[PDB]
Design an enzyme around this catalytic site. Structure first.
Site, PDB file in Angstrom:
ATOM      1  N   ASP A 159      -9.643  -3.467   3.896  1.00 17.55           N
ATOM      2  CA  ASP A 159      -8.673  -2.402   4.121  1.00 17.55           C
ATOM      3  C   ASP A 159      -9.420  -1.105   3.794  1.00 17.55           C
ATOM      4  OD1 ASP A 159      -6.415  -0.698   2.131  1.00 17.55           O
ATOM      5  OD2 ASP A 159      -5.974  -1.090   4.230  1.00 17.55           O
ATOM      6  N   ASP A 186      -5.242  -3.782  -0.902  1.00 19.14           N
ATOM      7  CA  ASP A 186      -4.512  -3.274  -2.047  1.00 19.14           C
ATOM      8  C   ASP A 186      -3.019  -3.174  -1.780  1.00 19.14           C
ATOM      9  OD1 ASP A 186      -5.068  -0.875  -0.223  1.00 19.14           O
ATOM     10  OD2 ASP A 186      -3.926   0.128  -1.794  1.00 19.14           O
ATOM     11  N   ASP A 189      -1.606  -5.602   3.488  1.00 25.06           N
ATOM     12  CA  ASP A 189      -2.803  -6.454   3.424  1.00 25.06           C
ATOM     13  C   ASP A 189      -2.456  -7.903   3.041  1.00 25.06           C
ATOM     14  OD1 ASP A 189      -4.663  -4.304   3.931  1.00 25.06           O
ATOM     15  OD2 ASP A 189      -4.561  -3.742   1.808  1.00 25.06           O
TER      16      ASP A 189
HETATM   17  F1  BEF Z   1      -6.166   1.222   4.964  1.00 21.43           F
HETATM   18 BE1  BEF Z   1      -5.127   0.206   4.479  1.00 21.43          BE
HETATM   19  F2  BEF Z   1      -4.414  -0.105   5.570  1.00 21.43           F
HETATM   20  F3  BEF Z   1      -4.478   0.821   3.470  1.00 21.43           F
HETATM   21 MG   LIG Z   2      -4.496   0.203   1.636  1.00 16.30          MG
END
Ligand code: BEF
Ligand SMILES: [Mg+2]
Ligand SMILES: C/C=C(/C)C(=O)O[C@H]1C(C)=C2[C@H]([C@@H]1OC(=O)CCCCCCC)[C@@](C)(OC(C)=O)C[C@H](OC(=O)CCC)[C@@]1(O)[C@H]2OC(=O)[C@@]1(C)O
Length: 994
Positions: A351, A703, A707
């Protein structure tokens, strides 16, 4: 009311038939609660304690080993007064072990943390609603909120449910949706309908989502959905429905078990087809009353010799220690198995917001005017270190630390940052970290001020809590903030009107401090500040300012820029109307430009180096974010996923562009592209799935709530220690330290672990082969038992178990992380190696049975028995005349078995040394390369002498100390196994690929 975003405010009110001014009546609430249930998620309670014990006894090999104890019990019972002193000893240990490792699994599996029962650390406790009950707003349990409820939210509030905005009270409403959509900048909301019924969360700008928090402003709305129908609700169910397979190693151990099972019975039937001749010999020594005890005497010895009873213990100890070492890196391993699978990782999906980045707006650059002289204009540019809200970092000029307070221009810049600000910074004594209060892009200014410390306020002797506002507090005492003209979307700037405070400077007068998008603010400046004086804004000056803003706004920087200015001679409060933001822009004119600050959601410090280490380890790194593509790509360039000027035509896709690709192309795109932006939670899960379709062990790093699904689908989910509760429950590992480079250390650890594991698994399973050859040989040759289950279980658990653990500590190769990941389908044993263990196995069987027979036929102190009177020893009693001579009990003597066991042991000590390296000669890679292995052999050997001397032991193990003449024979029988393998290896290196 899903689809509320596409409908207007009146439509949403009509839909639930509720008054916007009073809220639902206590009658409607009761009904809506009935029709929609509470605003909560179902309790995720699965597998109790006894449910685990069940699955503990479901392993194919365990049942076989257990059914083997049951058969051993009938035998211990049918044990005549010849050895009924310690008969039931066998069935006991066989059951004891099964219970030992069993309770271990329960104690191991029980250790867990629920997902929904832990998700309440994100689901707001309270909510604010207006209900016909009373005129004032009511603070109730968030769980008691129902669709149709009229809700109120304000700065700092955690949105209690999915809500359709009805009316914005402040000038604008900004919402931080990073925990759900990954957006790195708070979202400005509105109340108009969003037509496209297919609008994704990032497009529902008239909606507030449960779990997110208000960055700035105040608003009133109507609840659209609650419980599992909320955006966060849909994701949780998504997480719950995703299935996870067994680890590749666990799949190999299971396959091994299924195959071993086939071989056992196969041999059981094999021996049977060698005892059918019994129906030929004329003799009735017991039809179906006594004579039949010998079949099942070898059946249990086979199942015990084939199964590595100590493997479950060696592996657990290895994985457990592996988990300890990781914990020292602040990496909390939630699943013992993943400790190893992590080593097979080929792709690391990650992410962006809060994972690859800190998710804490940080000012890293700023500038003020240095000097102006005609067409010449030079700027004083500075950089700022630190990538979080903590008041820790430095201000640098030309890469060198300077004291901001010595630049009068910076003193005013800091002043504007501190005063033209509706937010602040704080230290969460509980989480032990600094947190923003209000808008991130404002708090960034707050911490910048704390770092600049323009008045050199004393801060060394302060607590974390005091340090958070020390320098800002000092500046807030210099001026009185009369009022503030809140940020407006048309003007794109914010200002505050200040009057002189301390009597230190009363000849100053009223001031207005302004900040906002550069273009508009600069266009409203007629002056530029130079230190403490001011010069008119000229084309050349404006040019230089805009050109540097331009650079910072793109390229290597791509920072969000804010221009700061002040109105030296502001209007009198009287001549100003403050109720309509449409007039604010005009009040913010004839300004004096002061400087610019550049900020961004920074990448964590160790990400770049980490990504370079993965590259050399043959591990791809793919960014999967919900944020816009521009920011996604910019961060990819900063951390090295993309070249500084690389063209990402077909290597970066948005959620839509991805979906516009036919399935086949999508799949291929996951192997080529490294940046997927503006994606939904299911997009991340989908991408992981495509990677897995190419048989790639994939890891996911996240986080936020968005996710969770992907984290679960990935073979190894890695959650940030500062991330959400959902993400953590969906992961096998947690970076308590938020150190992304620990992932690379985990991979390295996982590769070393696996290589050692392969060696001890091979070692242990190898000895079982030889053990089965011994059993089969004696059963086929008709000879007496050379080794018995009680002896096999001690060697498989202790004698060999200790060195197997030691192999777990084999020193890892120096190029462990300079090679691609090994294949998940790679078999632990095959090809040449299969032949090696084939030859070693045969060698052990023949050497163990032969050692026993030796004592029986040649030992200077054993009987001088003939070969077939030994293979027919069973007919000793009945047919004494044929092969007469001595006592028919000598065939059950402990000397021969002790001779056989001592050979098994000695041989295993040698094969342990052969297990240090797969194909390296003991001369090339010495035995002392692993001090532990050397000691483990000493320990195992001294434990052998123990079982041969301490009276109780030799009694129950059917043994007896051998003679030096007998040991020397054991050595001459065993040692050569080293020569055999030292040869098979040579053949593997020179005439083979090894
Ligand atoms: F970039 Be993640 F989707 F927070
Ligand atoms: Mg994120
Ligand atoms: C444990 C002891 C023994 C003697 C055993 O039977 O192991 C077999 C077996 C189950 C396998 C074999 C053994 O097979 C034989 O020796 C041939 C068949 C004998 C039939 C006789 C009928 C009268 C391993 C042990 O043999 C050698 C010589 O290396 C190698 C390997 O094992 C591994 O890779 C271990 C996996 C953790 C496996 O072929 C494995 O089956 C698989 O699926 C594998 C991929 O696993």
């Amino acid at each position: 009311m899903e689809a509320a975003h596409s409908k207007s405010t009146e439509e949403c009110l009509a839909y639930f038939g509720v008054s916007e001014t009073t809220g639902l009546t206590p009658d409607q609430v009761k009904r809506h609660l009935e029709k929609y249930g509470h605003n909560e998620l179902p309790a995720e309670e699965g597998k109790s304690l006894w449910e685990l014990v069940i699955e503990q006894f479901e392993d194919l090999l365990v049942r076989i080993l257990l059914l083997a104890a049951c058969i051993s019990f009938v035998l211990a019972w049918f044990e005549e007064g010849e050895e009924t002193i310690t008969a039931f000893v066998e069935p006991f240990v066989i059951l004891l072990i099964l219970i030992a490792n069993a309770i271990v699994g329960v104690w191991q599996e029980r250790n867990a943390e629920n997902a929904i029962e832990a998700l309440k650390e994100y689901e707001p406790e309270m909510g604010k609603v207006y209900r016909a009950d009373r005129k004032s707003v009511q603070r109730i349990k968030a769980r008691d909120i129902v669709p149709g409820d009229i809700v109120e939210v304000a700065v700092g509030d955690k949105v209690p449910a999915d809500i359709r905005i009805l009316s914005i009270k402040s000038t604008t409403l900004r919402v931080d949706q990073s925990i759900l959509t990954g957006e790195s900048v708070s979202v400005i909301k509105h109340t108009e309908p969003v037509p496209d019924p297919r609008a994704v969360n990032q497009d529902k700008k008239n909606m507030l989502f449960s779990g997110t928090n208000i960055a700035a402003g105040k608003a009133l709305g109507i609840v659209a959905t609650t419980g599992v129908s909320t955006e966060i609700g849909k994701i949780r169910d998504q997480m719950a429905a995703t299935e996870q397979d067994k680890t590749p190693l666990q799949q190999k151990l299971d396959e091994f078990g299924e195959q071993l099972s086939k071989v056992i019975s196969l041999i059981c039937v094999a021996v049977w087809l060698i005892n059918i001749g019994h129906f030929n010999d004329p003799v009735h020594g017991g039809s179906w009353i006594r004579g039949a005890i010998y079949y099942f005497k070898i059946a249990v010895a086979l199942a015990v010799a084939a199964i590595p009873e100590g493997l479950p213990a060696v592996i657990t100890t290895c994985l457990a220690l592996g988990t300890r070492r990781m914990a020292k890196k602040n990496a909390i391993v939630r699943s013992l198995p993943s400790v190893e699978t992590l080593g097979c990782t080929s792709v690391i999906c990650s992410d962006k917001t809060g994972t690859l980045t800190t998710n804490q707006m940080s000012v890293c650059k700023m500038f003020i005017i240095d000097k102006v002289d005609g067409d010449f204009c030079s700027l004083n540019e500075f950089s700022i270190t630190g990538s979080t809200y903590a008041p820790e970092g430095e201000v640098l000029k030309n890469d060198k630390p300077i004291r901001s307070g010595q630049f009068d221009g910076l003193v005013e810049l800091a002043t504007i940052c501190a005063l033209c600000n509706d937010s602040s910074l704080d230290f969460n004594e509980t989480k032990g970290v600094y947190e923003k209060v209000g808008e991130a892009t404002e708090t960034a200014l707050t911490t910048l001020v704390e770092k600049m410390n323009v008045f050199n306020t004393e801060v060394r002797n302060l607590s974390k809590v005091e340090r958070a506002n020390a320098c800002n507090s000092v500046i807030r005492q210099l001026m009185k903030k009369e009022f503030t003209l809140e940020f407006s979307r048309d003007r794109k700037s914010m200002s505050v009107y200040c009057s002189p405070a301390k009597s230190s400077r009363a000849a100053v007068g009223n001031k207005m401090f302004v900040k906002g998008a550069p273009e508009g603010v600069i266009d409203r400046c007629n002056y530029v500040r130079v230190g403490t004086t001011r010069v008119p804004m000229t084309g050349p000056v404006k040019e230089k300012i805009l050109s540097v803003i331009k650079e910072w706004g793109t390229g290597r920087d791509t920072l969000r820029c804010l221009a700061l200015a002040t109105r030296d001679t502001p209007p009198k409060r009287e001549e100003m109307v403050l109720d309509d933001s449409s007039r604010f822009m005009e009040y913010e004119t004839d300004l004096t430009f002061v400087g610019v600050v550049g900020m961004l959601d920074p990448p964590r410090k160790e990400v770049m180096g980490s990504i370079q280490l993965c590259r050399d380890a043959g591990i791809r790194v793919i960014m999967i974010t919900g944020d816009n593509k521009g920011t996604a790509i910019a961060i990819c360039r900063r951390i090295g996923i993309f070249g500084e000027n690389e063209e990402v035509a077909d290597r970066a896709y948005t959620g839509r562009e991805f979906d516009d690709l036919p399935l086949a192309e999508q799949r291929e795109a996951c192997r080529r592209a490294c940046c997927f932006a503006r994606v939904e939670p299911s997009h991340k899960s989908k991408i992981v799935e495509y990677l897995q379709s190419y048989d790639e062990i994939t890891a996911m790093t996240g986080d936020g709530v968005n996710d969770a699904p992907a984290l679960k689908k990935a073979e190894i989910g890695i959650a940030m220690g500062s991330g959400t509760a959902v993400a953590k429950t969906a992961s096998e590992m947690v970076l308590a330290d938020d150190n992304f480079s620990t992932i690379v250390a985990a991979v390295e650890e996982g590769r070393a672990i696996y290589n050692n594991m392969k060696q001890f698994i091979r070692y242990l399973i190898s000895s079982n082969v030889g053990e089965v050859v011994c059993i089969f040989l004696t059963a086929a040759l008709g000879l007496p038992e050379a080794l018995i289950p009680v002896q096999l279980l001690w060697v498989n658990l202790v004698t060999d178990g200790l060195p197997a653990t030691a192999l777990g500590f084999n020193p890892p190769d120096l190029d462990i992380m300079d090679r691609p990941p090994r294949s998940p389908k790679e078999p632990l044993i095959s090809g040449w190696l299969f032949f090696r263990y084939m030859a070693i196995g045969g060698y052990v069987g023949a050497a163990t049975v032969g050692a026993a027979a030796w004592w029986f036929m040649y030992a200077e102190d054993g009987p001088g028995v003939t070969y077939h009177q030994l293979t027919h020893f069973m007919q000793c009693t009945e047919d004494h005349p044929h092969f007469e001579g001595l006592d028919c009990e000598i065939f059950e003597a402990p000397e021969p078995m002790t001779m056989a066991l001592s050979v098994l042991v000695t041989i295993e000590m040698c094969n342990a040394l052969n297990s240090l390296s797969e194909n390296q000669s003991l001369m090339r890679m010495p035995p002392w390369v692993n001090i532990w292995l050397l000691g483990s052999i000493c320990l195992s050997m001294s434990l052998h002498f123990l079982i041969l001397y301490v009276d109780p032991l030799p009694m129950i193990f059917k043994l007896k100390a051998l003679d030096l003449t007998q040991w020397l024979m054991v050595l001459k029988i065993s040692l050569p196994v080293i020569g055999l393998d030292e040869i098979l290896k040579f053949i593997a290196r020179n005439y083979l690929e090894g």
